[PDB]
């Protein structure tokens, strides 16, 4: 059954207008990198033998072609992560007091108690995911990737979008969210007159993400 | 600076020389010249030797064709991105951040290059900033006031309103603001006067 | 392989141990029933880290997937030329997660990555010798966030950046018959 | 010779499949980078790009060989039926909402937001005039109050 049958009450003089709203937080996952594995043709195909290598010299640069292709895959795997995460020239840092007008980001920004500078979400993520062949290491350690993630998160929390397009200009986070409502055609006063409810829904929605991720394996 | 174009040209020239170099490889035959195995051997055994050479060359040409068939997909993806950029940065102004250059996009000018394109993205970047006190609203008469197209900033004693991307402070009137509600629900509301352009004129007339 | 004392428990009659890949990882002694691990002898690549020849002629070498101990045996130091013996030993032997780097001076500093190594290690050439270190992901910054503070630009710059995208490649076409056969 | 031919073929097949899978991963990483630049460093008007709904902000999160985006969206809720009008005729002139839509609870006509119901009173600042009332279809009669 493709889905619930539904019928709109269309007419020539009837409009429906929203009176409330819900802040929704949802998770999107995108694979960014792949394991960099480089294989040596000779060790895999001949191994110990030397006569085998002399015969393999007759097959031309089959070794060169395969090794070159595999190294290209390896360099690309690091170029991908560099482009995805290293989009901030500086490393912006959250203020020592996390008082952001009621929006609680503690679930997404790192806590020093965890040895790796990882937020609770990232800890759930890492914990949940479990002969001439060498797996090369990534150019960035997971600590460095987390550092870029914190830098982007801090930049957005403290300076809105002003930092991806220019110098980071500080802006009060409730004021930033008002700019964003004005962005989607809802005047800013709706946020100011509902800040407590808006922040509360945002906090609860952020929290539900951990449960929705941990229990569901796929 | 032309790393991408050079990479494409080099990867094409290389691997086209690898195919030709394979043309002088025995593949376990007696010689890598078809004529020679023919002019030094009787057909019963020259047949077997040439068969071995054919298998090796067929593998080499097939490998080159497959590699080119994947590199062609990469260049297709690059050209589709470039066609999209031409349409959305050259034929119009984009509000997609970090698509047409780094900054607030204004326009672009396309340039051609061998086997590729070069875009010159003209962008607007804020340069010199100050820091100012601000407030979500302004209380005038028991009514919360908010700005229409700007933010409320203070030079330390004078509350002004200005646009969000260039400091141009103007007098807070009822025209560049709008009234909604009371001064009790907003959080961080401040007190100042919303001058109405009418009453001074009325006193004048 | 490298036969080492194993800690696993074979069955009394079992003589061989294989991993997921059907490769022996433990062997038992034919005489004394001593069960020993089999770990393949070290191997890996050798990378040469060098600033451009138009800049300098010094090099530094990396051996991937090795503990620094087995470089002198693995490289055939006695067999190669006296110049190779320089990079088979020395005082500046730094161990990274990528392997063993011989010929670069590990420092306690951080800069932009110049020549990648791996596991966050990047190496470069500054006074005048080759160094290795851990990269710094750009300058740190703390934005002066405050519940009633902003920052508003008073000037602006009109920049022109350059972007290059490949659009097409050579329309090469190869004749299969004449390539494989020529006139034959 | 036979063993070498077989092993070489197995290696070639492995490399080819890895190259194709790497191209797929490259596309995914490119989409992730655009998503980072357009959802995190800015607000996206693109529909359904940064989450389902009206995108407000996205907070990135790292993962093993990937990235996780938490999307913040504004989703309208608790809708209500209303009667609308393309325009309101006051003095024989046609008036249209500058920033909203005329709605009527039955007694009065108000102009509200297209996405949240905050009814207002139709003034000469909430609307603008265009021509006479003989052209618009569905135009209705009401008063455009002037605070002046």
From Swiss-Prot, chain D:
Gene: S
Protein name: Spike protein S2'
Full protein segment contained here: 994 to 1141 of 1273
Residues bearing attached sugar chains per UniProt: 81, 105, 141
Function of the protein: Subunit of the fusion protein that is processed upon entry into the host cell. Mediates fusion of the virion and cellular membranes by functioning as a class I viral fusion protein. Contains a viral fusion peptide that is unmasked after S2 cleavage. This cleavage can occur at the cell membrane by host TMPRSS2 or during endocytosis by host CSTL. In either case, this triggers an extensive and irreversible conformational change that leads to fusion of the viral envelope with the cellular cytoplasmic membrane, releasing viral genomic RNA into the host cell cytoplasm.
Disulfide bond sites: 39-50, 89-133
Outcome when changing residue 78 to H: In strain: Kappa/B.1.617.1
């Amino acid at each position: 059954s493709l889905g619930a049958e539904n019928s709109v009450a269309y007419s020539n003089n009837s409009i429906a207008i929203p009176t409330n709203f819900t802040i929704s937080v949802t998770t999107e996952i995108l694979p960014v990198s792949m394991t960099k594995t480089s294989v040596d043709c000779t060790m895999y195909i001949c191994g110990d033998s030397t006569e085998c290598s002399n015969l393999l010299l007759q097959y031309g640069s089959f070794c060169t072609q395969l090794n070159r292709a595999l190294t290209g895959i390896a360099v690309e795997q690091d170029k991908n992560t560099q482009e995805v995460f290293a989009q901030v020239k500086q490393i912006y840092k959250t203020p020592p007091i996390k008082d952001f007008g009621g929006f609680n980001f503690s679930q997404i920004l790192p806590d020093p108690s965890k040895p790796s500078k990882r937020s609770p979400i990232e800890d759930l993520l890492f914990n949940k995911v479990t002969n001439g062949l060498t797996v090369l290491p990534p150019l960035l350690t997971d600590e460095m990737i987390a550092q870029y993630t914190s830098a982007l998160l801090a930049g957005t929390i403290t300076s809105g979008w002003t930092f991806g397009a220019g110098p980071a200009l500080q802006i009060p986070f409730p004021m930033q969210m008002a700019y964003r409502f004005n962005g989607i055609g809802v005047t800013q006063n709706v946020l100011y007159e509902n800040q407590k409810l808006i922040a509360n829904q945002f906090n609860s929605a952020i929290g539900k993400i951990q449960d929705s991720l941990s229990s569901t394996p796929s | 600076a032309l790393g991408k174009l050079q990479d494409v040209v080099n990867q094409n020239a290389q691997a086209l020389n690898t195919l030709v170099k394979q043309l002088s490889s025995n593949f376990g035959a007696i010689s890598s010249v078809l004529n020679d195995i023919l002019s030094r051997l009787d057909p019963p055994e020259a047949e077997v030797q040439i068969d071995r050479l054919i298998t090796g060359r067929l593998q080499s040409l097939q490998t080159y064709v497959t590699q080119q068939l994947i590199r062609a997909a990469e260049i297709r993806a690059s050209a589709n991105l470039a066609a999209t950029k031409m349409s959305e940065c050259v034929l119009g102004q984009s509000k997609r951040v970090d698509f047409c250059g780094k900054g607030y996009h204004l326009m672009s000018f396309p340039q051609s290059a061998p086997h590729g394109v070069v875009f010159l993205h003209v962008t607007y970047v804020p340069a010199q900033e100050k820091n100012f006190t601000t407030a979500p609203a302004i209380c005038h008469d028991g009514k919360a006031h908010f700005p229409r197209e700007g933010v409320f900033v203070s030079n330390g004693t004078h509350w002004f309103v200005t646009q969000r991307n260039f400091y141009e402070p103007q007098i807070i009137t009822t025209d560049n603001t709008f009234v909604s509600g009371n001064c009790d629900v907003v959080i961080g509301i401040v007190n100042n006067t919303v001058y109405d352009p009418l009453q001074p004129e009325l006193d004048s007339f | 392989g490298v036969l080492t004392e194993s800690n696993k428990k074979f069955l009394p009659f079992q003589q061989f141990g294989r991993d997921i890949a059907d490769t022996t990882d433990a062997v038992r002694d034919p005489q004394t029933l001593e069960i020993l691990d089999i770990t393949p002898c070290s191997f890996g690549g050798v990378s040469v880290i060098t600033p451009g020849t138009n800049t300098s002629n010094q090099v530094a070498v990396l051996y991937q997937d090795v503990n620094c101990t087995e470089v002198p045996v693995a490289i055939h130091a006695d067999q190669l030329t006296p110049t190779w013996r320089v990079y088979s030993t020395g005082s500046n032997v730094f161990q990274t997660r990528a392997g063993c780097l011989i010929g670069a001076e590990h420092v306690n500093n951080s800069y932009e990555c110049d020549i990648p190594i791996g596991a966050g290690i990047c190496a470069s050439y500054q006074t005048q010798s080759i160094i290795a270190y851990t990269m710094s992901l750009g300058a740190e910054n703390s934005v002066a966030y405050s519940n009633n503070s902003i920052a508003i630009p008073t000037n602006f710059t009109i920049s022109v950046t350059t972007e290059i995208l490949p659009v097409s490649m050579t329309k090469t076409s190869v004749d299969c018959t004449m390539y494989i056969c020529g006139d034959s």
